Symmetry: D3
Subunit: 257 residues, 6 copies
């Protein structure tokens, strides 16, 4: 259902790109003034997109929404190229002193691209059949979960030994499920049977729910200032919502099967 | 031009032998009632053995045009064995062959190796070999997975009573899992991650690991040849994975030099 | 009670022997026709024996059973001898490309032996004092438990990382209980105090009950084609019953104590 | 030797405090304008101190060296206060968005406290006798090493998995050496025998050597951009130089013990 | 009222650690060589001294005249000092290898004397009207006790028969777990007074309590298994009980402080 | 080659008695050390065993390869009764500890049982000698490794447990050896079950090979720890003579491994 889904995607992901520019900005060196401005530009861009998405509704004219999709797709492409650009400066050591992790940069670029791609599937009636969506969403989100588990463990203060270790065991849980998901993807279309796919979702579910439960707790502790970390609480909430979205997808794909 | 000829003969002398051996290994995994599948495997064995013989008869003086035609026929043999491995996998995954003995990972593994070969031939035939930074990343992302799978197969095919070597295999298994992920990340970070320093460190880190597995596979192979250890690894399988490890090592050293 | 016991043993173990003959035949190469024919021979002979034991009842003439015992006890000596001949051929590498694990072969042979000597026990009335019994069965069966955890781990498709790992944890669990059993053994009969034996039995039960559930779970998943393995739906059922059986014995030993 | 040792200590630790000033400012948010310039002030104070230290010689009037020590002591007290104040802002979440690890702020404050305490010992004639120094230096420095291994592992890009895991193994190695150090410490003066302290120095030396070498290597790969991290090259050379001084101390205690 | 709280606290402190110092006297005597008779005799007098101090501590009441309790604190603190000196003398003898054959872990001797020292310093706090405020109490007590629980896990693991592999593995896990909390506690402590926020202190207590409760259960079960003869060890049943009571003490303190913080 | 694997009746006898008599004598001291001071029956009974094996060791050392095979044969049967006696004593002690009849004593039950296994092995070896039934090489290889890999795995726990827990590095090293030999022992058990099929020269050669690297390494670790204890350089409750006692036992296992390797 094109209008339904378009707006869901955009409401969620544009909040994400908006938040991304804030985080990337926090990690720029103070003197990198052009990059700080770009970041602020993209901040307001996606902020604006966000407001527009919320002001639409299921009863909005499909054509108007197709144009919005096309427009949001172009913003998703522009934040993407911006992230790449930062990645190349960091990776060539052009920004000594800077505090963006290359992996987080690449990470946020993959989500931007997940976003632009989804918009194209929508505007093209090229959504995926259930067998393909189960594999591709999982292969995608399981890497994203594994990434978050490392961001948290890296941004936790090293004195927080027990929570650093807990995030470490989540970073290994998802490293390993991502690999099962990579194998399952190579064995397609042969792997794409009812019983293999149901088991695959079954097994991912218990972890994601656990991780989601963990990001929530972590978020509340950070907000209450109960732990030591360089984790901005908006970041903690952000990865919580990404986890929570993965879990909804997993649960709805398990209903469709 | 003559170097198109070298490179095609090297690729075929190596991978044709691998495709022929795959046919043997897969058939060894078949239940004794699967005569069609068994006979199909034997056909592919005969086919690639014959492709291998031809490839060792041609030479660096051979007409580039007859080499180019050999490539397209060999590339079609590759497409077909790939097609056949895919059908075996389908069957395993739907439990059509209860009692069969081929790991589905092994069936996808060898089928991945047929695809590698397929695409290399096309690359040569079009004169479309990758630039150094893409080759490096592409060859490794692929071969590090292969080494990772090897280490698992060895570990699963060793007899559970050979605790020390099973444990060693699992340590290798763990390292190449780790190296594949580093390569998946590099790959995602490309072209930004394709700088001289990053790629030299990537290859350096890989080389120490690959040479060590290479040595373990050889030592394993010598032991299985003399019945010094307990397993269900046919000696030729031990030799096969040792050869593919050696191949990978030469390629890394190749690129290492091209860059350094 | 000599009769109920014999038939219980024979009804259970003959099926185990029938089943080995079939598992072994699948490791045999297609060229190895004499081995295949002999294995199908032991399959047919224990199946026949299964059938005979399901026809008898606790009413049956003692002597007609004391001689069914000796019959069957010969059949178990013979299958034992055959699993041994397979072992020798495997260990000197005269059958390259076969798919039976030497550990598997020595393991069937140990089970086969166990049966042989139990029948002897039943006919000689040399059945074990309770303290000696608890230590003997547990040593034997813990080891069987420890091998099974390995066979499961090795015969699962390597792409089943989560499940391979679970089997490995069990494997280590049971190696540990066995080494504990072994030390109690050497400490016998000094170690054969009621509380020591009661603590022994308690520790082992938690693990055996775990693994039993795992096996049941795994079997159900392979039957349903939910997981990637080269474990036969029958083999999984086979180790489940041996697990199940061992738990019966443990529970009964705690009761008589 | 009062002058020698003062100058040695000052030349080393002044560069260290100057470097902290730089790392701390990198961790501040851009609107933290007063923090940034307070950091830049210490940067300068200590560069100047470093310059003066480097221009005096073993032959300088002890009375001027004594006064320099006292001047340096106060500078070290003030940056220690500055470090603590920053610790307080962070721990009460007054600075969201900032990127200085509280552990790192605490750690640099512990280094400042060490510097300042060594200047007092110097000026008072109250340096430790050997068996006390051995235990005290090691208890202190082994902790410095455990932290550094954790800072390295955290500041490494998460995708640098082999290097992340090597750093963790070093963190684990040093936690364990530090706890051994803490029990020896509790067991003193009884544990202060030549044999126990000889073996202490020996166990410790080998991981300090490996760690120094890992730091050298990390520094060189970062300088050459061969790996991914958020570790300024200078932070790499810095911890490398703290590892090296610990190792020089171990070697000189070992010589004295023998 | 306030004098009554001085008295209550003094007698709680003394009732508890007088028992501990006494038992330590026994434990250490058990680990001496049979030919070390002067040491054994000296251990035997300390047992008897704390036995009597414990007796008197249980006969005094909350109604006891504070001046007398004060005099009692001072004398028992002199006894604490004296057994500390003894424990340290022994540690010396061992670390200079002069008792080949003895069976007391030097870590244990040193552990016992840290508890002797704790007891001696609590009594001076009580007598001088100088108890820790809540923020410092919370950090000083956990720092002390976390090290104690860590040591205990080690002793259990070393004193279990090696054939008890599962139980040795649980002790060792608990040991690792408490090394970890101890080291969190040492970083919190260095970050004081900045780290002394109600929020950071509440989480510190919560995180420690999960562990201490869990080890407390374990030490009780182990104690019962040993009294019942169900497991193989060289752990005197009383020693198991002793370390259970110290865990229980520590869990009390965490609850009383969680309460007073909330 | 120092006689450990000799098949000459006299030489092998003296070698075995010289070595194991000293071992049992030292067990008599170690066991005594773990008794409560009030258990004087035990203390006295241990001192007597200490005295017996001390005596036997001096006599073994007085005999030569030239001594009359009839004397040696009677000596062996005496020494064999002695070994049966100390074995029963150790089992008695074990029984007392397992019924918790001695609260506060310090001998591990695994240690007591382990000393009774070394005793039983002395026992059975002298019976082989007198009856003329030393094992053929493929059996000796399996049987000795199974016995001695267990001895080695027990020792690395004895060291693990008797080191002060504040020696974290060394206690961790002990544990790694302990796990290695657990694993080597379980390999031998399987090898032993798979016999006589497994007794091929290639499988026994690999077995010994793998066994050797761990044994030489534990041997070296035990010599090093011995020297650190004599010097007072580490913290433990390991008597310096216990450290040397388990070094001599590893060392002998190493001769056996190296000599079997040659013969093989
Ligand atoms: Fe995001
Ligand atoms: Fe291949
Ligand atoms: Fe079976
Ligand atoms: Fe510093
Ligand atoms: Fe205590
Ligand atoms: Fe011994
Ligand atoms: Mg994300
Ligand atoms: Mg391959
Ligand atoms: Mg079985
Ligand atoms: Mg530092
Ligand atoms: Mg205590
Ligand atoms: Mg021994």
């Amino acid at each position: 259902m094109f209008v339904e889904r378009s707006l869901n995607e955009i409401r969620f992901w544009s909040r994400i790109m908006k938040e991304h520019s804030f985080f990337l900005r926090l990690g720029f060196r103070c003197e990198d003034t052009q990059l700080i401005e770009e970041a602020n530009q993209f901040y307001r861009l996606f902020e604006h997109i966000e407001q527009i998405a919320h002001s639409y509704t299921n009863e909005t004219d499909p054509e108007q929404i197709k144009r919005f999709n096309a427009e949001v797709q172009q913003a998703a492409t522009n934040i993407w190229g911006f992230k790449r650009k930062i990645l190349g400066l960091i990776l060539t050591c052009k920004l000594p002193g800077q505090n963006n992790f290359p992996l987080l940069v690449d990470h946020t670029s993959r989500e931007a691209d997940y976003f632009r791609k989804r918009l194209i599937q929508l505007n093209e009636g090229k959504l995926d059949a259930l067998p393909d969506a189960i594999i591709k969403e999982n292969v995608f989100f399981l890497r994203i979960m594994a990434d978050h588990a490392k961001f948290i463990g890296h941004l936790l203060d090293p004195s927080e030994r027990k929570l650093v270790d807990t995030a470490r065991n989540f970073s290994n849980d998802f490293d390993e499920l991502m690999y099962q998901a990579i194998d399952l993807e190579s064995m397609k279309p042969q792997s794409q049977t009812a019983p293999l796919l149901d088991q695959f979702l079954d097994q991912n579910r218990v972890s994601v729910a656990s991780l989601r439960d963990f990001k929530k707790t972590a978020r509340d502790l950070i907000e209450q200032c109960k732990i030591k970390s360089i984790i901005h609480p908006l970041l903690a909430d952000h990865v919580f919502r990404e986890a929570d979205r993965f879990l909804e997808i997993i649960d709805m794909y398990d209903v469709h099967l």
